[model samples]
Target: PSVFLFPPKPKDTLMISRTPEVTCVVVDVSHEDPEVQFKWYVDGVEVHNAKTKPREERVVSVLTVLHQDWLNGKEYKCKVSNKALPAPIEKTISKTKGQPREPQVYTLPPSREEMTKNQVSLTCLVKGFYPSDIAVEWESSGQPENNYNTTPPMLDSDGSFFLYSKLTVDKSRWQQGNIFSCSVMHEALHNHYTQKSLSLS
Candidate 1:
């Protein structure tokens, strides 16, 4: 059906894994009619979803950081892939507007749920997002915006990171018809390179 209908489980939902820093994994895809698009990964090494409007519509966000440990420190992951359907929403850490709507309970039974008896604990909800003014589209291009091999995103004043270069499918390009220059080589990731190129089909 449609996932993420949590306002404190007054209804029902499941299947959510958003690993992040300060633990914020929010992928809210609201206002659907059914052209469906969703895909995100981290442990699998694939990341994209840095589109926003604020006044809002067609928003995409992927920000979960961890690097205070410094032992080559890092930890975060997100997985979103849906051709089925959804029921979305939005957020902001503090863009200022007298915000306070709580039901915030991300439980894990004190970090030792019997090591395995926990049976996968997961929670979801981001009704009032306010983290950094969220003014991040990360400058612009002048050099290599294509052929993204990955690892080229950093511009922070607080909440910054938006540049997902991808063009992929399988590998097959030669004039007309059954096209597949792989579209840009790299689809095993999360094909949504949409207008940035890589339009397979």
Candidate 2:
């Protein structure tokens, strides 16, 4: 005798709104047994065809978007089904444009210059983002903006995410007490938001 399996559970989608958006869609399709097929759709258009992957405690499928389609507000859908299953399970995500919020900012401990005069290094880390749109940079007080160093953001274990940027200088520059800063850029309700500034010695 054989038993029938039911539909898989629908998981929430996660996304980050950066200058170039970063979107991640994850799903755990463990409930449906015997190698189920998964399909993904965007704006009513099929983006990914059905594919089979092993399902254990959880199966994760991640989709990253560097850019978003802004002209139209479209819905996303995911469906799971198996050959032996009676029905295909479907999940849909409604389009939501996030609001612009003032960037959330924090300060790092003032870094001390190493005794060795060869080089001075300072590190800065930023995280905790709803949209995961944070930017970090280092600039000299009187130097041109184009002459600064910008670092990339880091995703956390939960994948919500954060950023860490660093500035390195010779003891000569550190003695001058150059101003190095980190900033976050985010959108909420269609508005741009910026965070407070943090400086290092």
Candidate 3:
């Protein structure tokens, strides 16, 4: 089996209102090997004042930005590279100002081949949100799903944002009519959230 490397989710790159003085920009990578190097950059300049935590097979790099720098819209990014990877992975923090918008959710089905192999992948598409701060959770019949992946929010042409979360399910459970749900939470709803569910026959 090929060793897999998981990079930090894009949404993790920016934190909103984390503290009274500064917001945090964090980036990380997870791999089976520990021989990895990381570099941080702010507005095209390399930053040496980054904090790093090298533990096990993962490394976390963090950069702190003052409120003034955040307000002025400075760009922050991290680059990670290892022998296992063909090229370096770079993730940039996204910053925006405006009230949050609620997202519309949809469930996408898996392929026929996947279904034939007793496996199904459920994808939830969350669309047309703002501010880029949102959380998505997957549930199987009211229980939390432990295995899932959520992509980072991408900016839409209209300045809105969209992201997707995927959940892998066993076809046996799906054939048993398991109910899967995608719940989305955003600051725009003020403590409420939007959700959608799917059940395969």
Candidate 4:
């Protein structure tokens, strides 16, 4: 017969389950003792309203915090204590975010420079997509071109991303007119492509 002596520390990861009213921060407690104390903290300050349940192998604790305050950037930690252990174990955790927002695509044609250019440039703006990874394709008259400029996906205030892409084309092609297009690809699109095009007469 073996007795579980020193209980180990909880994993550094915390599961943040959100609801309309509150955010639930979950911590896994390795149960060597039935009466172990589970405590949650926000910025080193103690918090209450925590619920605990027993699993066959371990115990689980969920600390429900206000959703609005969680969104406002709260740093949290979980501590487990037992009288038999030499010291209490603690781990730090935080919240997570990202929603699948299909990108909106827009095209801009060279204007004031529509006259000044030795060659004209076209622009594509892909906006409001979640998860920074995205692809942009540039085409003239429906034929894709390898030569183009794309900026690193820039982050938006609302947790979405925007991509900027541009290319230079023959001046004659612009003034004479061809259907220039900007095509955006993203996970949210679900295998379908979204596009915007501009043509000048």
Candidate 5:
């Protein structure tokens, strides 16, 4: 009779916040198999060709530090496998408790930028949204104006949504250090307002 053997289980993955406000993910993939290799992923998308350092007893490991602009609620995953082995093993860990279907309003008040020219252009950038809504518009100084907001079908990646609206000013009425604003009102999803003002040159 032939005997079948199984590989050792990988250690539990841990996520910690380090100095300078960077998020670090530490995972241990040490097992009995010396040929085993490890891989890491974020938000279900593979971080191509990530670097790692091996620890004692041929156990592989990796540390990923998130960028300064990065925010919380992102998913992080770790996987281990060996080409020589018949089956590869995988482990996944997520900072979020569960995948959000409605795209909770964790991040609100989109980024706003003000640009100057003969006239002023105020822009509002909203991100991390999901599921299109019928109501979304950009207003000027609390007044509803035509063509103030962009059209539908905003930019999105991996189920997250992004939308931006721009408000143009009249070159004849151009004034320095004038206030311009953008507002967003949506239904069935998150709705809010964003504004920015710039000086005209």
Candidate 6:
């Protein structure tokens, strides 16, 4: 006899923040089976009043603690379990904040000035990112023979960095409804990256 089983695993993300006198912890679990259960603990003690909710395909668990506990360096973890697995999956929150804030991304359509010259100009703007280390790339449905230019990240008044990348393509290609994508990767996003797209109107 063959048995099929599905186990629950928590997402790699564990968001922690402090507000006034409280510290908030958020943990998310992803699994094929929706019946999976979640448990939250802080400083090795199970939290009885934690909130658990279903968010789309995943289950979100949240725990709030006093500011004192957070300042004391309490450990926070989330355990995900299901009958399919012999052992539960546990994910711990890192006390260190090594990631930067998420960046605001957008793109500008080809300008009329460039279109008159049989050329199209597309610009992607990435802003409000920290650490000043980022990667930007352009992709299209078809081969892009266009010229590309990327500006060095500039320091903003808020200490964040802002940058822009431009892609110049032939007007014929731009009017073909070819979709272009701008992908940005940064340390602040951790395992995830941001993307913006543009196409002819």
Q: Give the alpha-carbon lDDT of every model.
A: 0.25, 0.45, 0.66, 0.64, 0.41, 0.63
Which ranges of candidate 4 are over 4 A from the true structure?
1-97
Weakest 10 consecutive residues of candidate 1 by summed lDDT: 6-15
Q: Highest TM-score among the candidates is held by which one?
A: 3
RMSD of each: 22.8, 9.8, 9.7, 13.8, 16.4, 12.6
Per-model TM values vs. the true structure: 0.18, 0.41, 0.53, 0.50, 0.33, 0.48
Q: On residues 16-95, what C-alpha lDDT tens digit does candidate 3 reach at each position?
A: 43431222322343345546666767787887776655554234455665544654467776676677667877766645
lDDT by residue for model 5 over 2-29, one digit each (tens)?
Answer: 1121211111111122321212232343
What is the lDDT for 153 in model 2? 51
Cα lDDT of model 1 by residue, 51-165, tens digit:
3224244333334332221112222333334444443322222112333122111111112342344222111111121211111111112222233232233433433222222
* Candidate 2: tens digits of C-alpha lDDT, residues 71-127: 134555566666656687776644344432333356553345464557655555556
Give the range of the ten consecutive residues with the poorest summed lDDT in model 6. Answer: 1-10
Q: Candidate 1 at 56: error in angstroms?
A: 2.4
Lowest summed lDDT window (length 10), candidate 3: 1-10
**Which portions of model 3 miss their true places by more than 4 Å?**
1-95
How do all the candidates rank in terms of TM-score, highest first? 3, 4, 6, 2, 5, 1
How big is the positional error of residue 157 in model 6, measured in Å on the Cα after superposition? 1.9
Q: What's the lDDT for candidate 3?
A: 0.66
lDDT of 4 at 104: 84
* Top-lDDT structure, candidate number: 3
TM-score-wise, the better of 2 and 3 is: 3
Q: In each prediction, how many residue pairs overlap at the backbone (N, C-alpha, C within less than 3 A)?
A: 13, 5, 0, 0, 1, 1
Model 1: runs farther than 4 Å from truth?
1-55, 69-75, 85-201
lDDT of candidate 3 at residue 102, scale 0 to 100:
68
lDDT of 4: 0.64
